[PDB]
Design a protein around this ligand. Sequence first.
Ligand SMILES: Nc1ncnc2c1ncn2[C@@H]1O[C@H](COP(=O)(O)OP(=O)(O)OP(=O)(O)O)[C@@H](O)[C@H]1O
Ligand SMILES: Nc1ncnc2c1ncn2[C@@H]1O[C@H](COP(=O)(O)OP(=O)(O)O)[C@@H](O)[C@H]1O
Lengths: 54, 384, 236, 394, 213
Amino acid sequence: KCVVLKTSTRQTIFLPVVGLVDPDKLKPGDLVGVNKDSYLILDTLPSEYDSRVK
Amino acid sequence: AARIPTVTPLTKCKLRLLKLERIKDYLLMEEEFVANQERLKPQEEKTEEDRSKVDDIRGSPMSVGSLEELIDENHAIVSSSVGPEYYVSIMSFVDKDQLEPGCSILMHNKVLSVVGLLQDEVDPMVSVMKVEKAPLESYADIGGLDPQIQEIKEAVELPLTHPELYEDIGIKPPKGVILYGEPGTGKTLLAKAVANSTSATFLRVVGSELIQKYLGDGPKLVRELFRVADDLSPSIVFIDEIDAVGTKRYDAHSGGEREIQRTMLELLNQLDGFDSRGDVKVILATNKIESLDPALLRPGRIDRKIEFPLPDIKTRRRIFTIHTSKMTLSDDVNLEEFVMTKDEFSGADIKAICTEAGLLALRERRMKVTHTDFKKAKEKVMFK
Amino acid sequence: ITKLTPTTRVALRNDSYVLHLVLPSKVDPLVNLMKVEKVPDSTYDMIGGLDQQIKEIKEVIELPIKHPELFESLGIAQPKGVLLYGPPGTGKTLLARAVAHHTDCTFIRVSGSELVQKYIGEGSRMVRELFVMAREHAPSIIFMDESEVQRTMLELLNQLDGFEASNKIKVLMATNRIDILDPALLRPGRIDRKIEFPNPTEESRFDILKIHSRRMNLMRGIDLKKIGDKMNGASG
Amino acid sequence: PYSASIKKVEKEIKDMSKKVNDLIGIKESDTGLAAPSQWDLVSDKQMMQEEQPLQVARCTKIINPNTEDAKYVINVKQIAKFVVGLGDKVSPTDIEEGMRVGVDRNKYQIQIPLPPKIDPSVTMMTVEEKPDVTYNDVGGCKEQIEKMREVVELPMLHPEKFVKLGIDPPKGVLCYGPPGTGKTLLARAVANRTDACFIRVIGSELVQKYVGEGARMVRELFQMARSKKACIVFFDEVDAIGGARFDDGVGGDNEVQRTMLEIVNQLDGFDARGNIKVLMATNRPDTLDPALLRPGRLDRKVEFGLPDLEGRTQIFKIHTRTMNCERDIRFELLARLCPNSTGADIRSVCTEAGMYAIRARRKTVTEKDFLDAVNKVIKGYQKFSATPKYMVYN
Amino acid sequence: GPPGTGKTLMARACAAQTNATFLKLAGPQLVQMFIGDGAKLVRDAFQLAKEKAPCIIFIDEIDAIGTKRFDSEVSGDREVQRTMLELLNQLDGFSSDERIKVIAATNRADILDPALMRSGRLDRKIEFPHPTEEARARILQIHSRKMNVHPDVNFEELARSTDDFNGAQLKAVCVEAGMLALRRDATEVNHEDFNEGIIQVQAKKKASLNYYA
Ligand SMILES: Nc1ncnc2c1ncn2[C@@H]1O[C@H](COP(=O)(O)OP(=O)(O)OP(=O)(O)O)[C@@H](O)[C@H]1O
Ligand SMILES: Nc1ncnc2c1ncn2[C@@H]1O[C@H](COP(=O)(O)OP(=O)(O)O)[C@@H](O)[C@H]1O
């Protein structure tokens, strides 16, 4: 019932409400999209590994 | 600025006067054409309105950036001093001639457009090896041998003396001259004369200085010395103590023998690589050439071979009469007595004996030097 | 602008980054290196049983300090090399310290560390880094404790041998096993003079005791002569 | 007669020239500023057009887009990653995943694509100017010249015979010989001869400091080559990049093995370089690794040795094409007076002959002068001679 | 096996053979100056391979990471050993997977670290030797599949003249003959042409053959 996430700029911030996808939709270690303006997680980036392996 | 380079007349002939009159007439016509622009449509001061508008257009606070690529058409890619790569374009006063990686490009403060270039006054490698003042007096202060003085002159100064004599013969100066001789033979004294007589840039390189502690560093130091000397100006760079390539082993460098070997290979490449080094001369000396890498000496990288022997019994006279020119020595002793004191008294031996005699005279604060002072200096010099 | 010393701090506005005021005394890198060194400042009157060596060091270097015209009348070259050798730390270190003390010279003794390298230069490719710090503090002396040590010393000696055009620069290297030094450094023109620190005897320890115990709380009556007799010339 | 009349008039004109040029403005020496008659365009409109119109649009790196929509991903090496999109002035076929491009400084949207970063470490290593070594100036190795041309020039000169013949042209060439035998003197020849780009990889130019920081340079060089149409990469002193693998006990001399392996991989197998011909030159090839010399990567193994009897004559004829010497000189007798000498030795002999002739009084070289020069260059400098220690190739 | 005994050919055949996605990884390719960056590059490799369950990953020149561990204070390629350990962990053991197969190619099995050959990490060890006499002629038939030569060349004869030659050099003899054929401007390749090409491949210059008749 809690939301915990860290920005890509060495900044960590949490939202009392998960967002667009409920915690059932998400799992630890995931990488999703959050609002740069509202600092609210909007969507979930599907996947992207380093192009070196790609 | 470079209006006319024709000075071939060098006399009072009418041709020189006619050329000067034509130049003056052209200058007057240009001035008259330019004056009417302000007389008819000045439209501004053109002296400070332009400068003020440029200052107010380009960002007033100009930062210290770094150019890393080249974009000719109103664009440029660099990295912010904080780190963020930028796509700053080119401004009107760009004068894009220093568009090379590393030169800081100053961008605007409002829009961060390229405002100014970064005048560079560092050259760390060159500075840590640039000779500011002449080391010693003229070649006459070397004394005695002059078997290489003519040879070294032809190798270095003769190309710079009047490089038409070697041009009229249809050849280029010798590649390089390596001065190898007995310990304390005066090789450094030869470089002293080379510098006191030299005309172009000269770089001094400590022999161990080519071997660094971090693996891969030594080749970088060699490449940087080559860039600095070559890219700076016509130079005569002497890497003294070349025997230190592999002779001495130090624990500071992570790499073992395959690091001195890599440094030597890099030096060889920098001497006779795959491009045109330009007008650069090299004069290196060593006291133990028996271990120097054979490839670094093949005719084509180090051409002239010079050997310096100990001062001759006839040359010892000139050496002594030189190193004691200004000494107020008493006539009690005769230098020839100590001239044969040492069976193998090298050039450094005479200077050491003179210095010891001076010191001994000093301990008693006497005005002149006596024979006993020289006798006591001779034992303290050779015998230890 | 001239008063604004280059490589010095001045105040800077925030919204404009315009000059606001000078900054008085920010820092001196050589002072920081010396403080890291923590040199044991001494006094010439506290020198233990090396009086003749004291005059030798004076006559070795200091003479062209209070009387630069001394060698001009005789036409001799300025002495270059002075070294401290003998039993380790036999007072030779203290003699070196007292030399600068009574001579007023910039003391810099290095052990080839890496933290001080952050003040000499970014990479310290050559040994000329220290000279830059000394080059502007002409009233300076160079001291080096006891194989790359010789290499740095070899470069220094070659540097201050005619290639270094600055006059009145003194460097002194101290170490033991003079017969184990570098033969290249053994050139007669490199070491201008040599001084050794022989193990003090009772005749020398008496003053050593008078200096060392001078700062202690003794008992009425000392009788240090017998104790020094019990001291069979150990070291300084 | 009027010595002061003309000098004063000339000085007056020279002073007035500056007195009038200072009235337009060239003075006030700046620190990287252009001529006021060089930035005139940007005064009110162009500056308001070169500045007001455009934006910085800082460049960054892309990761990959997401399907079902544009769904591009924005990533910054030093700033931050982010979900962004391209601009209205880009195509959706060119959405390269992992592409360097700039995004709208405000909209944080990629408005302009960019070519891949150059890594100036391997960008500075392009020739850009062929040497002054021509075919007529590298005489003495005619067979080697033909063999090298068949691999670098002939195959690209008329690429019609090889297609009709039905055989893949030979891949590369390795030139291993005694020191000074003419390796670089021909590599410069290859560079000044053809037109395809030639990359000079100095054998020391690949040993980097960090662990693996050197191999990456190999990949960078290989990419910068494959980027162009046809490339010929000439590496000298190939004895430094990697000799072989001999690890025993404590790991030593292994890092160079990784660099050599990376160089081999980009050179053979897995969609090999293709339109890139290798031209290496080792001076002590005895240590070359079996994998690098194995055919298919450096198939040709041409060797350049000492000219026997006519090579010396050709070297004398070529290297002495601009020397003022007596016409009655017998050069072949000189070529017979040098049992085993290197071509660089022949050029140095011609030089020393020039110097000796210029020494005392002469204006043209003399046969006796060349003879005396031989006695010192070969017969006098024979102490090392650089030949005996490398003749066995060890 | 030998330097050119043939491993790239087997890998390229396997790639076009199976109806899946093959993973191409270069031995030294998986490294970086960052501390452990190679570990991350190998973990991402294993994840991308798990992406398509039907797939094969080939780690060519496995000697780059398979270097035997050493005991020394100063150096020893601790990062390289870390990458090797990461590959070993990702291969089999704690939280391994049975969905794909990896084909590895190493040129000197001796330098290979002992762990790299530990059953779980690698099960089947296949060593490829050089063709002796019959595959020596098969190589010439294959590599000369498109080469046009008149029926005046004895493939077996050239195979017997090509003693102790590698498959790569065996096929390169065909290229050398084709280039010599272009030198001759003819249309077909003569037996003497292949004989001269075999000699040119050896790279043994004759110089006054009198000391040994
Ligand atoms: N066949 C030749 N024709 C003309 N000049 C030659 C020839 N062989 C050598 N030279 C001369 O050799 C010099 C350049 O060749 P260089 O000595 O660099 O060869 P190298 O084998 O690459 O040497 P190293 O391997 O020691 O670097 C020039 O002076 C060049 O004129
Ligand atoms: N006339 C002379 N001939 C030779 N050496 C001389 C002469 N006069 C002085 N010297 C001494 O030669 C030395 C020059 O350095 P050098 O002998 O080249 O040292 P090294 O051989 O150890 O590199 C100095 O010690 C200098 O005093």
